Symmetry: C3
């Protein structure tokens, strides 16, 4: 009457193999997570870099204009007054 | 003769647990997808930022050269002509 | 006495479906991997871009100072000597 010895062995084999595939995908998944987590950090550092670059490039543009004004005045001074 | 009541219960337990692990990996996977999708967007914005920075840094380099030329002429004017 | 024909069919159905879910998650996982791998490359190119931008923005700041010095000397020359 009783009969479950060969069936539970089949379930065990199919379970083992399915577990192995789930295992590999999990390990790959964890690997991608750490990678994209460090990528997020590198992303932050990049964002902080471009803004500071935008600040210093602004200070340069303003000082360049200052040089342009002072030169234009040097040009409207010694060349066209009395002579 | 008939016998499948205890076997289908074993399959059900192993199925439930395998489904749970597949479930968690799926949720983590979806989480990584949204994260890397927003990272792709931040990547685009960064690319657009560095090119525009490269355009304005070019306009500055050209105008700096212009200042250098006009100064060099101011220096070759009032100091070394007649006096 | 013998009895495993209907049980192995149940295991087969549950196996097929679990395999299908594992299959999809695997394909999504592979897709995220290639995406984050190319993102890593774009990350490298960005890093190389910001440093070179930092080098040229430095050369500009130094030359701007040079222009400031030469102008300040042009201003302390023709306006306040003998006249």
């Amino acid at each position: 009457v009783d009969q479950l010895t060969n069936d539970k062995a089949r379930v065990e084999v199919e379970r083992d193999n399915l577990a192995e595939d789930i295992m590999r995908l999990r390990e790959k998944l964890q690997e991608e997570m750490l990678q994209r987590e460090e990528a997020e950090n590198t992303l932050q550092s990049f964002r902080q870099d471009v803004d500071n670059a935008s600040l210093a490039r602004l200070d340069l543009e303003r000082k360049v204009e200052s040089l342009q004004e002072e030169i234009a005045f040097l040009k409207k001074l010694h060349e066209e007054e009395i002579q």
